[PDB]
């Protein structure tokens, strides 16, 4: 009906803006963060897609957990994730952030950032190449494309 058409157009418009404008927080812990720099590098420019780093969590939408999440670091990661305002998305990058990585059986490593934060995308590798990270970002974008918040609300 007319209401369904209107809400479909509106939540396709809203998802388009979030998909086309991503502001990852400047947050990299370990060797996986170098591939973030190489994605920001001219070869695979991520600013081309509308993905630009921002420093403060308050002005960020995506947390790219790239590195090893230690016990001494987990509270800070949770705090910055909480301070990051909604809507927020999480991309775990590399084996350390995905599961345990090389340091899975260790006394001071958290096996998987998903134990601390809800992870939206998982990018495998050690480190995942810049192409792999860019593909993960594009997959996150396409995942945002199929969200229907207004369509769920209208039928709610």
């Amino acid at each position: 009906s007319r209401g369904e058409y209107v809400v479909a157009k509106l939540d396709d418009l809203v998802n388009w803006a979030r998909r086309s404008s991503l502001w990852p927080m400047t947050f990299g812990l370990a060797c996986c963060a170098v591939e973030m720099m190489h994605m920001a590098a001219p070869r695979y420019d991520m600013d081309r897609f509308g993905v630009v780093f921002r420093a403060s969590p308050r002005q960020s939408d995506v947390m790219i957990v790239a590195g090893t999440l230690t016990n001494k670091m987990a509270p800070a990661l949770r705090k910055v994730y909480d301070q990051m305002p909604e809507p927020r998305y999480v991309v775990s990058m590399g084996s350390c952030a995905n599961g345990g990585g090389y340091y899975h059986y260790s006394y001071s490593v958290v096996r998987g950032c998903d134990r601390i934060v809800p992870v939206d995308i998982y990018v495998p590798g050690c480190p995942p190449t810049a192409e792999a990270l860019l593909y993960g970002i594009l997959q996150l974008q396409r995942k945002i494309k199929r969200e229907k918040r207004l369509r769920i609300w209208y039928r709610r």
Binding site: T70, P75, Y105, Y107, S108, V110, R115, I116
Partner: protein, 208 residues
């Protein structure tokens, strides 16, 4: 020409042996043993209380200007009575050489801090304490450096389990990270790799 085997340096071996005899003669009160490894690495084993005199001598002596502290670590050997083995690596730029000084201690016996001789010893001894439990007497600021805040136990001891005793996760009920006893999804699979046949007869221990 034996391309597989590493070459040897008799001249440097003799120089290191002469210097070891020299330092042993100069400091007989604390120096207990002097060894020269086959790859030309001088090694001195001294009494634990001689750390400050021996290090000050090796640092400020004219014939031994070891002004740079290369490293400072410890080795846990549970069988020995004094399990912890404090190791100092020193570099002499003037003579282009290196030396090693080894002392022994246990959990309760304190070792005099060498921060008054080398400043890197501050963080190196903080790491030694945080990892093994060896307490250094006169330290400007002794506390944990690598382990988590409030971490219990010393990880690098040979009696400490690899996975530790606790793990971390986020508990939504209390809206904060919580620490719970370790529970692995897949247990670490211990491998028995040692072969039952003796490899090097040169290191064979006598059957007494």
């Amino acid at each position: 020409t034996r391309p597989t085997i590493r070459p040897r340096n008799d001249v440097v071996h003799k120089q290191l042996s002469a210097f070891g005899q020299y330092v042993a003669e100069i400091l007989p009160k604390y120096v207990q043993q002097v060894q020269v490894s086959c790859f030309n690495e001088l090694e001195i084993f001294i009494h634990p209380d001689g750390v400050i005199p021996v290090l000050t001598f090796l640092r400020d002596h004219t014939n031994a200007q070891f002004k740079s502290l290369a490293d400072l670590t410890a080795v846990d050997v549970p069988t020995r009575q004094n399990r912890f083995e404090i190791v100092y690596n020193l570099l002499s730029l003037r003579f282009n050489s290196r030396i090693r000084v080894k002392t022994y201690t246990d959990e309760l016996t304190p070792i005099e801090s060498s921060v008054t001789v080398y400043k890197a010893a501050n963080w190196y001894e903080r790491e030694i304490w945080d990892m093994f439990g060896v307490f250094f007497a006169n330290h400007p600021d002794l506390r944990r450096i690598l382990t988590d805040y409030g971490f219990e136990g010393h990880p690098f001891r040979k009696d400490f389990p690899l996975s530790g005793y606790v793990e971390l996760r986020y508990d939504d009920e209390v809206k904060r990270v919580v620490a719970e006893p370790v529970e692995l999804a897949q247990e670490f699979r211990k491998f028995d790799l040692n072969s039952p046949w003796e490899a090097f007869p040169a290191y064979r221990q006598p059957p007494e």
